[PDB]
Symmetry: C3
């Protein structure tokens, strides 16, 4: 029983780049499966390799993911991301197709805490601990709102994607990195995953779910 | 005026299976349109048949839905689900394309209540009443969070999709089935639809919207 | 460095219509890029024209968006909408593919306020001010819930898409238009954008984010 999914984020055009498949398990732990480059070369995450096969068909203009010998373990939502660059670097993510099946070492990134509780205007600080050293220009932060696919929020440790509101910043180097918000705003109620792609295989943090309380209220009418 | 939508969840590969179109009306009442099998055979829901036409093109690797003679009544969001099995059973849903048009018997599943209000840690119990007897291994439960497409939560009455947190269980047989949560968790704030596919045509419940209160608070500072 | 995206909302079938690309910037300001018609003719928004190129391939059954000379400014989420009509008028939107890049006159519609705070059952009233006169049958209202793509809520100023709950209405003419809800309902917690397509180039309002308070509570146990 094989899993076969299609991807088609990019159009015609396109002269290079890297299509990568990524799955998110329930629990939200993100997993980097592998990629296929324009000139045909692929990379599969060792955790599989024997099972996974990424391919493409410029004839149909579709990129495929074949995950042989599936089992309830592969139940997750699958994303297909496209990545290109010179100095300018483009990154777009597909929608996530949710898959459910029935039959019942690297740089590990440690997100903490698993769920930060914040009221509005409050200063917020999230930490990501890398099980080893990671190039500071290959450390990324993604924001994900329930139902949406990951949005590149901060790239190269401290650089804010265009449009990220000023209240955000990104600190770090070597094994300890962090993201902070000068002061909540409820539009920041999401999940933040740190990402590292300097060491193969590429990894993601477990997640911090960020959500704000309501703020105080009183009843001295009174 | 015809409605023409495409689907492409599966990739190359694939040696069988059943692509099925399903629409969700505003109100969230889900509707099972029909399916097309790999070896070419189709099934259309009687409510239409004269209007609907499902087809595929392995050349473009796309599955199509043609719904002739549309009218404001067909305004809904359309999903394309793929279903395969031996003993292992794969099921993945497309994204939902939202359609809006302007011009102004079976086993009916009864969800109840239409909207359960729960605080955290509370025991929760949702009921689904079938207008007739339904095979207990063809009764399914789907969870849908606003904006997302249905996620297979429980299959065969009481079996939890991999990753469904332990606090969930599924009771039932014959005409009365139910789903319960040992104790809320706000991540359970979604909609739960029961599904039956033992009797043609296949049907879905109306929906229960599940959402939690906040929990108590006090002000004895004091 | 060019941006190349694909679209495939429509299926085979289809005898005309207009595929249009629209981007939404972080901040949510919506932007109308252009369209391509079935018989091949295109229209590009003047803000670009030199950069944008819309095309299609009936061979692959895909519609493309090529946005040459990208820069962090084009970071947004891109939608592909399909529009057809005789008297019956079909409109469906794609999913939004989120794009992020790194390198650091018309009828302007003014949404107000940028964020209305409402408790349940309350009468709500949102206003849209057009920098000039707009045909009242080319003024539209879209609802967007975080993570979802715009849903056509009201068309031709005052006509409710099928399924829009009765509590909604749409007032206006000439330069001032408005949308109202007879009484909240928390399922109305979304964003509402007014849209005008009588004058080229077509425009969208900035957005009003609509969200309800909780309602009062007391503690006289007591
Ligand atoms: Ni109180």
């Amino acid at each position: 029983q094989t899993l076969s999914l299609t991807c088609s984020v990019t159009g015609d055009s396109v002269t290079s780049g890297y299509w990568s498949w990524i799955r998110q398990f329930p629990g939200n732990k993100l997993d980097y499966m592998g990629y296929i480059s324009y000139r045909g070369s692929t990379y599969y995450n060792p955790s599989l390799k024997s099972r996974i096969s990424i391919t493409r068909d410029t004839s149909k203009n579709q990129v495929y993911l074949q995950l042989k010998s599936v089992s309830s373990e592969d139940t997750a939502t699958y994303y297909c991301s496209y990545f290109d660059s010179d100095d300018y670097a483009m990154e777009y993510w597909g929608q996530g197709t949710s898959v459910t099946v029935s039959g019942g070492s690297q740089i590990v990134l440690t997100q903490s805490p698993a769920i930060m509780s914040a009221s509005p205007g409050e200063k917020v600080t999230l930490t990501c601990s890398a099980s080893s050293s990671v190039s500071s220009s290959h450390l990324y932060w993604y924001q994900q709102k329930p139902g949406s696919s990951p949005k590149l929020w901060i790239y190269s440790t401290s650089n804010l994607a265009s449009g990220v509101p000023a209240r955000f910043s990104g600190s770090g180097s070597g094994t300890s990195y962090s993201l902070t918000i000068s002061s909540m705003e409820a539009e920041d109620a999401a999940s933040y995953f740190c990402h590292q792609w300097s060491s193969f295989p590429f990894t993601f943090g477990s997640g911090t779910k960020l959500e704000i309380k309501r703020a105080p209220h009183h009843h001295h009418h009174h």
